[PDB]
Design an enzyme around this catalytic site. Structure first.
Site, short mmCIF file in Angstrom:
data_model
loop_
_atom_site.label_atom_id
_atom_site.label_comp_id
_atom_site.label_asym_id
_atom_site.label_seq_id
_atom_site.Cartn_x
_atom_site.Cartn_y
_atom_site.Cartn_z
N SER A 176 0.95 -1.12 0.01
CA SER A 176 0.19 0.09 -0.01
C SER A 176 0.83 1.37 -0.06
CB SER A 176 -1.02 0.17 1.27
OG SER A 176 -1.64 1.33 1.15
N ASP A 226 -8.61 -4.16 -6.88
CA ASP A 226 -8.60 -3.42 -5.71
C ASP A 226 -9.51 -2.25 -5.65
OD1 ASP A 226 -7.43 -1.69 -3.51
OD2 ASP A 226 -5.63 -2.46 -3.84
N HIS A 265 -7.37 -5.75 -1.58
CA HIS A 265 -6.36 -4.82 -1.33
C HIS A 265 -5.50 -5.61 -0.40
CE1 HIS A 265 -4.21 -1.32 -0.60
NE2 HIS A 265 -4.76 -0.66 0.14
#
Lengths: 134, 138, 846, 144, 53
Positions: free
Chosen positions: C713, C791, C823
């Site tokens: 991320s 995602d 995600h």
């Protein structure tokens, strides 16, 4: 028990539920030879014993695979206060190393939960407790 | 509630506490062929009575064989062999000792032997360092 | 230098690496437990039975797989110096709360994606103490049960009563009305419904949604938390029951208000994201507001309804503010939080600004909400009918130059003494730079408004002056407010229990202070561990789920006990234990925590996983695992074995694993977090490089020529920033799910850490790593991009645009797609592939 | 972006493939031709007596069989092989743990052997890396 | 030949636990049209053969 009286036949009430009984008339006792479980007391009384089984009792306890079972989990239905020592058949480890006697902690179940009471002392193949043997 | 034995293994290191265990062999007399069952189990009377009731239902009888002379590690991989193995079908390679409740069948190796005679070598052998812990002539 | 004095990692086969990951998985089935959570203490009210309380909680008992509602029985006494382990009694009788192979609705999977709650079964439940009602969402439809209200405490597990419906779709977000436990409410099809458990009677209340077409054409929702609120402000509900009941006095009718959020998501940009059903090859529209784009147009609204004695919805009524919300409250872009005062008098709400620098708490009294009709004469009629005195009170106004972190701690008191001048507690980080609790008394003096005409309020037009602002805590540490922490206010003894970092930032401890006088801060937890705590509603005993870097997490039940004349010094004595510390792996080494100072003498903390079977002298290849972004602290004195097991796997292969809490991370105050203001990427990687230099000097096994930087991320984003701006130090860079262009990211995060695109232009081009792709290496096998295809948060576009600009700059890469994972890699098969790909990539190219 | 970490692999799935090993190898012998069933379904122990008395009422006879060395998982697929598989009739050679209720009936695997001789060696591996998870062979001295 | 085809292949590779490598051309429909993207395609082909063949 096979104590000072000799071979006393243990009363089985049912094979399915592993319930046992004896009435043992003399003082002390000698180990029952199936595994080495032994309780010693002073006087002629009735005792009932069950072998309670861990599967439905350790699924109630959360790190179930963390601990290691060292024996039978026998419940004793005797009158209160008249049992003065109990010897549960602990597996041998003192012959080796890295197993401590100040590490051992004892499983006394209740409907409330597991009590980890510290035992009195560990033999080569037994553990003794004091007078409150619930 | 019931009173119970010591229950302790420290989190900070795996120790493999040794156990007082003993394996059991079940014979057949009546049927067409003969099958041994080797129960790599601990040495509790409750586990022995669980095996006794199940084998009694299965028509199997235990003969008292020479027990192990030494403590041996719980949970470890113990290969099962035999001089009569290989020609006869020992069912899994690596058997397991680790403790299970009496209320289920315990972990076992099946061993179809065919003829039973009076004695065939069996082997169990550690996989950590290949040291002998047990032998029995049956 | 010395190629005979550097460690070469043993190159395993692919099947070997799978064998290693599987052998790790052989005990991760042990180390994950999903320790119990969401505790609710209820007393037994017996005084002659054996058990003092019953603790209700969620848990997977590992006699089963999915987590379930459970309870423990806390006894009145315990045999001391011999610890009691509480049994995990199953509250329900072993039904399953997930369908086959985990199939859920798309809204359920999105909400679980938002809270990142990976475990299956009953996700979370709602409880009402007096009736003893457990209303929860399990499997296909809502369920409820009761245990010890007007009825009694069961001993066997019972059956969960199902809530039947005529409605279609899932029934999300259910809550019990506190004033009447028979009534409850939920969102269905993005409109607020309410029902009654015993009679089955339902009722829709809002009609902002119609279900005419897709979400590109049906844009108004009500009572639901939008995307940016769900994923950046951690609010997952948009409706709040009134906790008290007022009486309309027609004949006997009991009114029940609900505050809800109207949302007009028409102007917010729509993005298409691939559906989980890859075969269908269709997308889902998502109202996703980019930076600078319009956020949803928000408003607060009162949904009332009136019931008979028998519990039937007699009347219903939508209500809206006398002037429009946008006009009564300019500069209000997000409703961070909201709720009601405990007495029910006023409905409070925390507003927040577009730039997130002007948070202000406001109280909205229910008489300010007129009914809502198209008839402009009824509207004018009730604008005259509203009294002159009732007024929104901007009670509190936090203003800063960095950004406002949303602190949800706000405990208003009953104001029965001198019935104006509301006295409340409020966490305030912007004042001293650190989140500290305060007791603040603002005087509520209404000036009197003519609500018939529409006017524009001024800058601080509803701002009440403050009577007093006593600071209950102060120091260079902070009170936990975010991440679902909370305070517990015993008003009987006048104590407030909070969590904080007063000993050290690496641990969370339960503290108590009196709000009568800012006296002595009593710690209740043992030091040397970090604790997540939860009090009884009677404030007599709490739970602490705690752990350390060495010890696994345990869950102990402590009991406040002592002389009642000084309750602040009531000693927490260990009463019973719920969950013990699990068995660590045979090949797990605990990681070592360290700290160091920067050249600016700012203290950074760090972790290290040492290489297993280290031989001194040799230099090992080092994986700098990184997150670095705000609102996340990787290093703290907590168990790292469950979430960072791969880091131990790396160590077990021989990689040094370094983890550095760069500047801008949480837990350490506003001035620390604010070094990344308008410069995301420009300070964190320098701190990470500095950490590497420090760990290299301290410990002698860090090969600087062989450094991998791995991140996910936001962390991956840094790995790519690392490979761009510090290319000579980082050998490779495994960037998982990177945010490669900031201009595409959503409002809530970016508009806060940086500003609107017109404001911070150089900050966006400097931080958008995909626009600096020319500085990525010419060498191959130095950059591995990982991305989950479906995602919703860091969309596939980011990796896609990165790969686009790599193509245009002629730079090599490698890429791995996870076509099913959104995600977080959730599927275990995909996680196993991810880790064997990581081990292989490091094995070969590091 | 609040730490979208991988979260490892929870694999909250163990100790049940032993108690679904005992339901495997259901044999029916009215003539010397024998037919077989296999069941692998997780998460409870009250499934066991229901499926056991189900096959008792539908005329399939018991035998104790080796539990898996390491227990398997749900949400994943396993293969069934061996000497009797392929040679003798195994129509569902693919098995899979997925939860179904204690009361309800289950997916099986039909397996005819005919005149079995003296033994039928069987296997249940995993479809991930084909590790030899499970081993057996049936015995006509334990047939009814 | 929609992207789904490569996506489903990568999906089933993940489920079977098999390695791969992958290259995406984000702006190209079916033939790699832009010369820069085609040049990357060719240098990737030469590199892959150079290293692993």
């Amino acid at each position: 028990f096979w104590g000072p009286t000799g071979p006393v036949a243990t009363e089985v009430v049912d094979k399915e539920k592993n319930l046992y009984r004896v009435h043992f008339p003399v003082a002390g006792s000698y180990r029952w030879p199936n595994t080495g479980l032994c309780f010693v007391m002073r006087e002629a009384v009735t005792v009932e014993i069950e072998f309670c089984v861990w599967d439905q009792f350790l699924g109630e306890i959360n790190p179930q695979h963390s601990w290691m079972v060292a024996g039978p989990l026998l419940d004793i239905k005797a009158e209160p206060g008249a049992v003065e020592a109990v010897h549960l058949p602990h597996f041998v480890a003192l012959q080796g190393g890295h197993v401590d006697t100040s590490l051992f902690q004892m499983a006394h179940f209740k409907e409330e939960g597991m009590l980890l009471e510290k035992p009195a002392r560990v033999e080569l193949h037994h553990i003794v407790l004091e007078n409150p043997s619930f | 509630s019931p009173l119970g034995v010591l229950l302790k293994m420290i989190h900070n290191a795996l120790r493999f506490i040794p156990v007082t265990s003993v394996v059991l062999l079940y014979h057949r007399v009546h049927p067409e062929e003969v099958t041994f069952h080797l129960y790599l189990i601990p040495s509790d009377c409750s586990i022995r009575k669980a095996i006794d009731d199940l084998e009694m239902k299965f028509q199997f009888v235990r003969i008292h064989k020479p027990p192990p002379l030494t403590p041996l590690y719980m949970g470890c991989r113990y290969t099962v062999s035999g001089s009569g193995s290989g020609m006869l079908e020992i069912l899994p390679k690596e058997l397991e000792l680790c403790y299970r409740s009496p209320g289920e069948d315990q972990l076992f190796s099946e061993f179809y032997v065919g003829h039973l005679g009076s004695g065939i070598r069996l082997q169990v052998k550690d996989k950590k360092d290949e040291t002998l812990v047990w032998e029995a002539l049956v | 230098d010395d190629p005979a004095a550097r460690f070469q990692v043993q190159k395993h086969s692919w099947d070997g690496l799978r064998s290693i990951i599987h052998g790790s998985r052989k005990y991760s089935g042990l180390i994950v437990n999903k320790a119990p959570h969401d505790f609710q203490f209820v007393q037994k009210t017996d005084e002659s039975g054996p058990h003092s309380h019953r603790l209700y909680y969620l848990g997977m008992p590992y006699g089963s797989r999915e987590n379930s509602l459970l309870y423990s029985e806390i006894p009145k006494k315990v045999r001391k110096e011999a610890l009691l382990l509480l049994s995990w009694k199953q509250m329900l009788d072993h039904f399953q709360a997930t369908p086959h192979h985990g199939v859920y609705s798309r809204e359920e999977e999105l909400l679980r994606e938002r809270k990142r709650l990976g475990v299956f079964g009953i996700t979370s439940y709602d409880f009402h103490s007096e009736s003893g009602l457990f209303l929860f969402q399990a499997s296909n439809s809502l369920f409820h049960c009761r245990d010890g209200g007007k009825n009694g405490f069961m001993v066997s597990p019972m059956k969960p009563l199902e809530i039947k419906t005529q409605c279609s779709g899932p029934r999300m977000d259910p809550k019990i009305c506190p004033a009447d436990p028979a009534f409850f409410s939920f969102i269905n099809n993005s409109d607020l419904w309410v029902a009654n458990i015993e009679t089955g009677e339902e009722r829709r209340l809002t009609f902002c949604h119609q279900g005419l077409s897709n979400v590109l054409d049906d844009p108004k929702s009500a009572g639901v938390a939008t995307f940016v609120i769900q994923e950046e402000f951690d609010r997952f509900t948009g409706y709040w029951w009134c906790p008290t009941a007022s009486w309309e006095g027609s004949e006997g009718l009991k009114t029940l208000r609900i505050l809800y959020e109207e949302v007009d998501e028409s102007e917010v940009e729509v993005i298409h994201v691939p559906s989980p059903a890859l075969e269908e090859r269709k997308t889902d529209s998502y109202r996703y507001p980019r930076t600078g784009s319009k956020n949803p147009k928000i408003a607060l609204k009162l949904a009332e309804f009136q019931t008979d004695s028998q519990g039937k919805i007699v009347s219903t009524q939508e209500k809206e503010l006398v002037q429009p919300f946008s006009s009564l409250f300019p500069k209000v872009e997000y409703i961070a939080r909201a709720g009601w005062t405990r007495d029910g008098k006023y409905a409070w709400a925390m507003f927040l600004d577009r730039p997130q620098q002007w948070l202000q708490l406001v109280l909205l009294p229910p008489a300010l909400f007129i009914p809502s009709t198209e008839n402009e004469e009824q509207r004018l009629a009730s604008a005259r009918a509203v009294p002159r005195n009732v007024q929104p009170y901007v009670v509190y106004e936090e203003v800063t130059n960095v950004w406002i972190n949303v602190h949800d701690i706000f405990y208003p008191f009953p104001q029965s003494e001198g019935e104006d001048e509301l006295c409340f507690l409020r966490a305030n980080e912007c004042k001293t730079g650190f989140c500290h609790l305060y007791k603040v008394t603002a005087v509520l003096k209404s000036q009197g408004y003519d609500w018939s005409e529409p006017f524009s309020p001024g800058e601080d037009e509803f701002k009440c002056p403050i009577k007093e602002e006593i600071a209950l805590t102060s120091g260079e540490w902070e009170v936990l407010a975010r991440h679902g922490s909370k305070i517990w206010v015993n008003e009987e003894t006048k104590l407030v229990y909070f969590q904080g970092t007063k000993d050290t930032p690496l641990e969370h401890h339960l503290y108590v202070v009196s709000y009568e006088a800012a006296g002595e801060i009593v710690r209740l937890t043992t030091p040397g561990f970090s604790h997540s705590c939860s009090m009884s509603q009677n404030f007599d005993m709490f739970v602490s789920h705690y752990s350390s870097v060495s010890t696994p997490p345990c869950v102990h039940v402590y009991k406040l006990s002592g002389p009642d004349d000084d309750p602040l010094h009531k000693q927490p004595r260990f009463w019973a234990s719920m969950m013990e510390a699990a068995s660590c792996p045979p090949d797990y080494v605990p990681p070592e925590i360290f700290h160091f100072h920067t050249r600016s003498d700012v203290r950074l903390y760090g972790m290290i996983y040492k290489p297993h079977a280290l031989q001194p002298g040799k230099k090992h290849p080092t994986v700098l695992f990184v997150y670095g972004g705000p609102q996340v602290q990787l290093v703290n004195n907590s168990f790292k074995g469950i979430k960072y097991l791969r880091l131990n796997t790396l160590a077990s292969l021989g990689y040094a694993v370094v983890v550095i809490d760069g500047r801008g991370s949480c837990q350490r105050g506003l001035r620390f977090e604010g070094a990344l203001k308008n410069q995301m990427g420009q300070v964190e990687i320098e701190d990470q490089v500095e950490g590497l230099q420090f760990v290299a000097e301290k410990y002698g096994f860090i090969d600087l020529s062989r450094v991998a930087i791995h991140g996910w991320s936001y962390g991956g984003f840094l790995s790519l920033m690392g490979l761009i701006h510090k290319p000579q130090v980082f050998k490779v860079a495994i960037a998982g799910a990177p945010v490669t262009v900031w201009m595409a990211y959503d409002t809530g995060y970016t508009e806060r850490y940086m500003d609107v695109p017109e404001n911070n232009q150089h900050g966006y081009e400097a931080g958008s790593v995909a626009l600096h792709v020319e500085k990525l290496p010419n060498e191959p096998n130095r950059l591995l991009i990982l991305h989950g295809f479906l995602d919703e948060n860091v969309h596939f576009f980011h990796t896609n645009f990165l790969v686009s600009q790599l193509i245009r700059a002629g730079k090599p890469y490698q890429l791995q797609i996870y076509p099913n994972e959104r995600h977080s890699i959730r599927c275990p098969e995909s996680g196993e592939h991810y880790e064997v790909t990581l081990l292989h990539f490091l094995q070969e190219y590091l």
